[PDB]
Each structure stands twice: as C-alpha cells, then as structure tokens.
C-alpha cells in the first residue's frame, strides 16, 4: 500500500503512465479496439493473450512482469441506463479486487464507458463516482488518465472536493 493513499488526475496517454499497473478500457473480445484500448494494445500487445472477459468483469494478463487489468465496461448503446449503470459499477469493483490481489502501490486508470461506449451521453460524474466507490477501500495511489482539458478540470475538482 501507499503511505498516504491519494487520487490524482493527469491529461496524457495512459500508455506513458508512471504507475505499477494499468487498467485497460477493454472490449469483451480481447480485440485491439480503438482509443485507450488501441494505445494499450500498441504498448503491451502480449497482455491480449486470452484477455477476453464478459461485461462487468476484469481480467489481468501480465506483459513481462507489468500487470494489465482488462476492465470491460458496458456499451450504453446496447444496455438500458439501469442495467448499464449496474455493469459499470461491477467492472470497477472487479478492478479494486485485482489491484488488491496484485499488491501494487499504484494504478493508472481511465474512466470506463466514456468515449465510444458512452451512448453519446456525458458520463464523467457517473463513471468517476463508481471509480471512487470501488477504489476508496483500497490503499493504492490511483492516477486517473484523461485526454480533454475540460474533463481534467472537472475530475481535479471532484478529487479536491472530498479532501
Ligand atoms: C471528453 C469526452 N467527452 N465525452 C462525451 C461523450 C458524449 C457526450 C458528451 C461528452 C466523453 O465520453 C469523453
Ligand atoms: Cl501524451
Ligand atoms: Cl469507452
Ligand atoms: Cl477525456
């Protein structure tokens, strides 16, 4: 565990993270995909051996000794708001279980079910609150990665609000 477990946000490519493991915003089929998933495939392609897993789950595959936690959030184009919310909360609970099991002191994590799984809705607050619900009982330093300047400010505000 970290001496003083924290949350931080950075606006940059999660493939360049400075943490002990990474969470991939994966598809259920273990395909290279697009966005974060494609960046993760280019950086850690070995971690996509037998990475397919159902929606609402996380599956860890090593790239050398570096753990890639493939977390599959729901695609809100396909799920109802209710069932999508339940699956999104579940994926983050499975990430917290894997982070704990691995014994890492830090993890790099994107906001699940934003971008192409958002069903065209702004889900910053929904996704980030599920992240906090799962990760608050863990003692890893959490570094959230985003690409948008306005999202950086909103995530930073939400972190600082609760300190
Ligand atoms: C930046 C981002 N904007 N969005 C977004 C998507 C739909 C509606 C509004 C906003 C993301 O998911 C990431
Ligand atoms: Cl970058
Ligand atoms: Cl997404
Ligand atoms: Cl973003």
UniProtKB/Swiss-Prot annotation:
Binding site for ADP-D-ribose: 13, 27, 35, 115-117
Intracellular or extracellular location(s): Host cytoplasmic vesicle membrane
Annotated effect of mutating residue 36 to A: Partial loss of mono-ADP-ribosylhydrolase activity
Phenotype for residue 13 to A: Partial loss of ADP-ribose 1'' phosphate phosphatase activity
UniProt PTM: Phosphorylated by host on serines and threonines.
Superkingdom of this protein's organism: Viruses
Domain Macro: 4-163
Membrane topology classification: Peripheral membrane protein
Subunit and partners: Interacts with mRNA-capping enzyme nsP1. Interacts (via C-terminus) with host G3BP1; this interaction inhibits the formation of host stress granules on viral mRNAs and the nsp3-G3BP1 complexes bind viral RNAs and probably orchestrate the assembly of viral replication complexes. Interacts (via C-terminus) with host G3BP2; this interaction inhibits the formation of host stress granules on viral mRNAs and the nsp3-G3BP2 complexes bind viral RNAs and probably orchestrate the assembly of viral replication complexes. Interacts (via C-terminus) with host NAP1L1.
Function noted in UniProt: Seems to be essential for minus-strand RNAs and subgenomic 26S mRNAs synthesis. Displays mono-ADP-ribosylhydrolase activity. ADP-ribosylation is a post-translational modification that controls various processes of the host cell and the virus probably needs to revert it for optimal viral replication. Binds proteins of G3BP family and sequesters them into the viral RNA replication complexes thereby inhibiting the formation of host stress granules on viral mRNAs.
Domain comment quoted from the record: In the N-terminus, the macro domain displays a mono-ADP-ribosylhydrolase activity. The central part called, the alphavirus unique domain (AUD) has a zinc-binding function. The C-terminus region, also called hypervariable domain (HVD), is mainly disordered and binds several host proteins. This intrinsically disordered domain contains 2 SH3 domain-binding sites and 2 FGDF motifs necessary and sufficient for the formation of nsP3/G3BP complexes.
Protein name per the record: Non-structural protein 3
